[PDB]
Amino acid sequence: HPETLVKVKDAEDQLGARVGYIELDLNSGKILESFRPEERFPMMSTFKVLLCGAVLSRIDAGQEQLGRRIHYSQNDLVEYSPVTEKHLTDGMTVRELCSAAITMSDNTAANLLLTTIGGPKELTAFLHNMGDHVTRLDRWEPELNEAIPNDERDTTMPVAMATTLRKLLTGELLTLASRQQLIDWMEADKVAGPLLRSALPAGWFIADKSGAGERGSRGIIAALGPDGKPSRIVVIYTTGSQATMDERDRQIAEIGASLIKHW
């Protein structure tokens, strides 16, 4: 709805920065609404959904197992690793690593998983081989959150991320069990509360993954809809703002409120 575009424009005014927006129909894949759909924005932690998308693809191929234990040392720990720092001696399975990466946005869990699939270059090759020819991952955590202006590294386009997310969740790329496993992780997301979930009515379904980085970078990708069933993909990115995190989260939440109102 056009009214939602008014809020996105209002958001850019409030934040004094760019805001990429795209509303996609999960079913047909038809683009419902868009704003700066083909401009690049830092992916940040939202790439973790794609990372586990690739990990699950390998699980399906038999090249990887969900229960395989991965051991790491203190040398591997990077900033913001709430789950991995508590299991240095115990280690963690591939299933736990993806849960920690998506649900908790654990940075080290992303790096450990990144090495098992071949790193950034392989994740990009995976996305390319599935139709996404623009989304690219170059660095590791936490460097991929730099958000240097005009830097095309570790970025995506709202439209690319939206369609790529749709293919992973509803396409035939992953097995039914893996597609379902991916969404379960996204639904259990416990760090995106201040965003779209706050503007969500009771009974609605929400599977998401937030992103935060330097230079006011903030974003979120989601699959939501009424009656406990997802029916639409929403992708919101913004970078360049000097606004605080609460002000940034408030604007994104307002976009989500408008999105709901004119559903």
Q: What is the CA radius of gyration of the chain?
A: 17
Nearest-10 crossing angle of helices 2-15, 245-261: 170
Provide the number of structural domains found in the chain. 1
DSSP tally for the chain: helices H, then strands E: 8, 9
Burial 125-139, CB ≥16 within 10 A → b, else e: ebbeebebebbbbbe
Is 209 annotated as contributing to ligand binding?
Answer: yes
Could you give the residue numbers annotated as active site?
A: 45, 143
Within 13 Å, how many C-alpha atoms sit on residue 11's CB side? 29
DSSP β-bridge partners for residue 23: 33, 234
- CA angle in degrees (0–180, nearest 5) for 251-154-217: 20
> What is the CATH classification number for the domain harbouring 32?
3.40.710.10
Burial group, residue 225, by CB count within 10 angstroms (0-12, 13-18, 19+)? middle
The secondary structure element, H or E, covering residue 99 is helix 94-103
Task: State the sign of the Cα–Cα–Cα–Cα dihedral 37, 252, 257, 204.
Answer: positive
Distance of alpha carbon 217 from alpha carbon 238, whole angstroms: 6
Residue 245 and residue 253: Cα distance in Å, rounded? 12
Place of tokens 């760090």: 191
Q: Is residue 211 annotated as involved in ligand binding?
A: yes
Structure method:
X-ray
DSSP code, position 136: B
- Angle in degrees, 0-180, between the axes of helices 119-128 and 47-60, rounded to the nearest 10: 80
Q: Which residues contact 113 (CB under 8 A, 6 or more apart)?
A: 51, 52, 55, 94, 97, 98, 101
**Phi, psi dihedral angles at 224 (to 5 degrees):** -140, 165
- Residue 79 region by backbone torsions, left for phi larger than 0, else alpha for psi between -120 and 50, else beta: beta
Q: Determine contact, residues 237/169, Cβ cutoff 8 Å.
A: no
CB 173 within 8 A of CB 192: no
Backbone angles phi, psi at 150, to 5 degrees: 75, 0
Give 162: exposed, middle or buried? Use CB within 10 Å, 0-12, 13-18, 19+.
buried
Q: Is 86 annotated as a binding residue?
A: no
Q: Which domain holds residue 39?
A: 1-263
21/38 Cα distance (integer angstroms): 10
Q: Are 156 and 43 in contact (CB under 8 A)?
A: yes
Token reading at 215: 């230079």
Q: Structure tokens of 230?
A: 């997802």
If you write DSSP's letter for every residue of 135-184 in order, what string do you get? Answer: -B--S-TTGGG---TT--TTEE-HHHHHHHHHHHHHSSSS-HHHHHHHHH
Closest CA relative to residue 56, chosen from 174, 161, 185: 174
